[PDB]
Design a protein around this ligand. Structure first.
Ligand code: HEM
Ligand code: HEM
Ligand SMILES: CCN(CCc1cccc(F)c1)Cc1cccc(NC(=N)c2cccs2)c1
Ligand SMILES: CCN(CCc1cccc(F)c1)Cc1cccc(NC(=N)c2cccs2)c1
Ligand SMILES: C[C@H](O)[C@H](O)[C@H]1CNc2nc(N)[nH]c(=O)c2N1
Ligand SMILES: C[C@H](O)[C@H](O)[C@H]1CNc2nc(N)[nH]c(=O)c2N1
Ligand SMILES: [Br-]
Ligand SMILES: [Br-]
Ligand SMILES: [Zn+2]
Lengths: 407, 411
């Protein structure tokens, strides 16, 4: 019931008690581990509200105080009456910081307490959502010195009036199926690119077309908006040693901003909660650039390097991978856009886990996601045992809205 | 029930029913995943169901389920259990069991090979000198002058747990490790404790960087005894690089034959506590883990110094750069000397083909993603993108405590 995690590089053992507070289920049973699966009323809401307010009042050293008991009473009356309740600003901020803190797949959580929370609960239209979003993008981008931020749109009601950002990230590149049979641009976004086109976007049909926002307010039909080009910081990719690298024509955007997740706080559901931080270098150079189902540039790069591509055992893929990743980092650094390498981020996370074990009694962590997609065992996280479990407040996946929305 | 796994690179979806036959526990519950935890005297009444389940699996695999041979065998085992409290496997059933324990090993990327396993039956062994001779023969067979052949040697099973056969070595061939008074380590840091045991027992340590350890062999619950593997049987590969001519001067080498000797093999409820097994290396085992773990040979700094990379900031990726060169070196050296090795691209590609085959003929393939994904270049291997289901089937290889922690010394 009290659980130990061991670091096999350093022999440091930590004891986890925090898992006992865990509420949601994992996908696993005593018979089967699903650790590598990508995705496994009034009556319901009051318990969730109480659990939340209890931890909030605990966090501000006021557990069992007059004001604690009063608020529990207040929220209780409001659920009875209205079927829902509203969070105080302080609660909303706390809840959003804690959803990040609880994100077991997130290596960047040492930063969790510094999140800037933009309260957009007064938003009513898609044009309003667009304004809030542009403001978030400009604030977070900060001319290259990125700051973490979340923008929180109104909470779900009867669930026929959901706010949604149909985009998977605020800033992403279009993908277009070709006559040819190949894909132009990012193959991850073909379907959404098509949705934008059918809703009426005029696609320029290039390799790196920033997608328009498709914004849904109040369960209404979603609308298109272009993010002012001037607010989208992008980085041309060059290599500090290979002059030819630039001729690949590669670029990426500075601001990673997830917009398709659902934020749950005290039972309330925020279906539009775009959040942003900054990139770990491998996200772009290993996954975006080198996944076979993504930009898949490994072959072209290897060719420019004149490596022996005859045999897998020459490790030509591996050599090319390292160079691509060196270039991503050098390019961001040269243009002064915040980026972290996988060594520094994982070192940060081990230090963060130690803080959380010491200060909170644990840190839920998903090893499959935390270990970087290159050079795993040369980073400290590879050697660190992790316990994965689900705490609330939380960020959750939710169905893509086009499968759900009725026009 | 049916469970699906999806490959996120290919969209290939597979359906698992084999997990229904799983008996043993995982460590996980509905409230916690223990998937990255490294480690998450039997009665007659427990023994007969375990035997029956095993024998039913064996008779089904030879298409004789329910035959008179199957039924006579069950009754014969049942009678042996009630009167002697245990039972002996037939040679055929021992072969089937040892192969299946490999087939079932969820952390093994090399399982495409599982049905080609040379089984050496050492159940007539009685003494440590007996075990030495069996082990020498295994090494020489498996080594086969570089054309490595998978094999396992199976010593007598556990009886009362006071008469256990054990290889105290964690692998048959491994390098010594010496803690120096100044706190540095000479040789391999992973093997310090066991090296100290060997010295205590009388081994004369050459005290160098790659000294092959002596075997420490326990027969029949007796105190273990020391033996040196004939050097002429220990195939080694000097590590050089195809382009970097200074790489040889690092003084690196490694042995060709990886041979695990500290696991316990469970077949139909019976426990084989000494069951050394060998295959061949995937290159990353040596070039990533043995050479570059901070707690092992730890050569990254010295290699990157010699490549003259920028070592002032981790963001030059000097470690990742040095890591790749060392791994190229390991594979080049093994190939140049005609010693079997597999690269992590080949091995993971093979494993994915193995796993699809298994899903189709067997209804599943339990696999531990944390262990199957290689310790470098994870996502440019196909296994990174493959969902897997981890569950435990018997026959199985299981961990067991180090014998120096539990042995009752005779004197
Ligand atoms: C400040 C810099 C940050 C870094 C460097 C970072 C790093 C990462 C990385 C590399 C991933 C894996 C993503 C992937 O492979 O696709 C991730 C996952 C995640 N992070 Fe962060 N993170 C940061 C900030 C944030 C913030 C501000 C939030 C929310 C407030 C957040 C919540 C998440 C969540 C929820 C996941 C898991 C997503 C999923 O399961 O699909 N992180 N983090
Ligand atoms: C034939 C070539 C083989 C290759 C390339 C291979 C590859 C591997 C590798 C790379 C690992 C992970 C090792 C580590 O990180 O420590 C492994 C684990 C394992 N393999 Fe193999 N394997 C082979 C044959 C065998 C054989 C013959 C057996 C037994 C009959 C075996 C049973 C295992 C087991 C039980 C593990 C898990 C060990 C643990 O949990 O500590 N494999 N395999
Ligand atoms: C590339 C896709 N990432 C999610 C992966 C995913 C999600 C749902 C379904 C999938 F198939 C795959 C998006 C993501 C999520 C969290 C963090 C990041 N990377 C970042 N550095 C940040 C984004 C926002 C704050 S930090 C990317
Ligand atoms: C080096 C350590 N490996 C065990 C891992 C382990 C387990 C518990 C604690 C540890 F610190 C480390 C040994 C191992 C096991 C299985 C296979 C291999 N590698 C091989 N290629 C083979 C060995 C025998 C047949 S194939 C190595
Ligand atoms: C099937 C497997 O779970 C899947 O490929 C995962 C593995 N680990 C990951 N880790 C991170 N950070 N991001 C991912 O998209 C994935 N993909
Ligand atoms: C804590 C973590 O589970 C541990 O480092 C594991 C990770 N994956 C592994 N995978 C393999 N093949 N071998 C290992 O020793 C490990 N170590
Ligand atoms: Br970070
Ligand atoms: Br193989
Ligand atoms: Zn699990």
């Amino acid at each position: 019931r009290f659980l130990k995690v061991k670091n096999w590089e350093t022999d440091v053992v930590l004891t986890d008690t925090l898992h006992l507070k865990s509420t949601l289920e994992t996908g696993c049973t005593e018979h089967i581990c699903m650790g590598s699966i990508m995705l496994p009323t009034k009556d319901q809401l009051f318990p969730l509200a109480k659990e939340f307010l209890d931890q909030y009042y605990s966090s501000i050293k006021r557990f069992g105080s007059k004001a604690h008991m009063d608020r529990l009473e207040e929220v209780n009356k409001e659920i009875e009456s209205t079927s829902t309740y509203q969070l105080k600003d302080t609660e909303l901020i706390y809840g959003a910081k804690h959803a990040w803190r609880n994100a077991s797949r997130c290596v960047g959580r040492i930063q969790w307490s510094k999140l800037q929370v933009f309260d957009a609960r007064d938003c009513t239209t898609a044009h309003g959502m667009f304004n809030y979003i542009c403001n978030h993008v400009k604030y977070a981008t900060n001319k290259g010195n990125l700051r973490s931020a979340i923008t929180i749109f109104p909470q779900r009601t009867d669930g026929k009036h959901d706010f949604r950002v149909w985009n998977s990230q605020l800033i992403r590149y279009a993908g277009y199926k070709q006559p040819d049979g190949s894909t132009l641009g990012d193959p991850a976004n073909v379907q959404f690119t098509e949705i934008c086109i059918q809703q009426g976007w005029k696609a320029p049909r290039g390799r790196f077309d920033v997608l328009p926002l498709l914004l849904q307010a109040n369960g209404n039909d979603p609308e298109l908006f272009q993010i002012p080009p001037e607010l989208v910081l992008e980085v041309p990719i060059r290599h500090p040693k290979f002059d030819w690298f630039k001729d690949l024509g590669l670029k990426w955007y500075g601001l990673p901003a997830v917009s398709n997740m659902l934020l749950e706080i005290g039972g309330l559901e925020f279906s539009a909660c775009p959040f942003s931080g900054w990139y770990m270098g491998t996200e772009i150079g290993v996954r975006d650039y080198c996944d076979n189902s993504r930009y898949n540039i490994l072959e072209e790069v290897a060719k420019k390097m004149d490596l022996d591509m005859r045999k897998t055992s020459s490790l030509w893929k591996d050599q090319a991978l390292v160079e691509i990743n060196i270039a991503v980092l050098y390019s961001f650094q040269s243009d002064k856009v915040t980026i972290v390498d996988h060594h520094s981020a994982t070192e940060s996370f081990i230090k963060h886990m130690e803080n959380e074990y010491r200060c909170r009694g644990g840190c839920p962590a998903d090893w499959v996601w935390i270990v970087p997609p290159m050079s795993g065992s040369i980073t400290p996280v590879f050697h660190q045992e992790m316990l994965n479990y689900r705490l609330t407040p939380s960020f959750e996946y939710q169905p893509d809205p086009w499968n759900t929305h009725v026009w």
